[PDB]
Symmetry: C3
Subunit: 88 residues, 3 copies
Amino acid sequence: SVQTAATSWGTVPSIRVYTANNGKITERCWDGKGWYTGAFNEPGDNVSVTSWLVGSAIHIRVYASTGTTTTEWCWDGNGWTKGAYTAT
Amino acid sequence: SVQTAATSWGTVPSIRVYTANNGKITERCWDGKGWYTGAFNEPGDNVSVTSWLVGSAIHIRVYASTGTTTTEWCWDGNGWTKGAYTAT
Amino acid sequence: SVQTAATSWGTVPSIRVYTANNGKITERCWDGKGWYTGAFNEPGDNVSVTSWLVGSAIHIRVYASTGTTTTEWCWDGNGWTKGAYTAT
Ligand SMILES: OC[C@@]1(O)OC[C@@H](O)[C@@H](O)[C@@H]1O
Ligand SMILES: OC[C@@]1(O)OC[C@@H](O)[C@@H](O)[C@@H]1O
Ligand SMILES: OC[C@@]1(O)OC[C@@H](O)[C@@H](O)[C@@H]1O
Ligand SMILES: OC[C@@]1(O)OC[C@@H](O)[C@@H](O)[C@@H]1O
Ligand SMILES: OC[C@@]1(O)OC[C@@H](O)[C@@H](O)[C@@H]1O
Ligand SMILES: OC[C@@]1(O)OC[C@@H](O)[C@@H](O)[C@@H]1O
């Protein structure tokens, strides 16, 4: 079936749910006022996530895996880009 | 194999581990004094979870997936019910 | 594909990413100065993780599953050992 990963922050809260479905990962977002589709859209068969809130900034790390390759995607306030993570 | 998801809160801590096994999700609970089987029992092949503790209240969201359908289950102090999440 | 689980703590942050790949779980670690391979290496086809930071101590629980058996692995400052979790 589809595979999901979830994270949340604050007291509203904000929630992010990532779904790997048919080799693509998409993102659904809640900030207290309805679910919406987030900016994150990248390939992957499996997803995990962690996040940490510091001051006014949310930092999110999404680990997207296809085959034996895992790509880290980073949100630090300015869109999603690949991070330095490697699996070694 | 079976697939799990875990969350924890406080300093004891309380831990919740959700296991999707043979199309059913069950819940094991630790509150500092032994593991026990929790109230959560719903269908699903895949599970993720997030939780947030505010004051005296734990809020838990469990995302249960079968095929391409994901159901959000909500704990807000008074049993588990379906939440408004949709995958779009 | 490979399956991952992630957790993080503090403001640096420290991040731990567990990967189940070909029946083995390994751990990659970030403490602010590059990724490295962690001490955790145990069998499993599926992994989840939760952690909680209290004072100067990180506590990590990794749930490693093969078939219908889930083993809890505990970090409490002094290496990884099996915890009391059972699935019942
Ligand atoms: O729209 C809200 C948003 O910016 O929140 C942070 C990330 O989750 C983004 O992908 C998302 O679009
Ligand atoms: O700011 C991005 C970054 O440095 O954040 C910490 C880790 O997630 C790294 O892999 C990543 O490149
Ligand atoms: O028994 C403890 C309990 O109420 O804690 C909150 C939820 O995890 C419930 O499913 C669980 O039964
Ligand atoms: O109180 C329940 C609820 O509003 O909590 C926030 C989100 O999890 C929603 O999908 C959900 O319906
Ligand atoms: O090296 C850092 C380390 O000690 O951090 C705590 C655990 O994640 C360990 O497996 C890891 O080796
Ligand atoms: O200190 C280890 C331990 O007591 O921590 C809390 C739970 O993770 C238990 O299963 C585990 O044996």
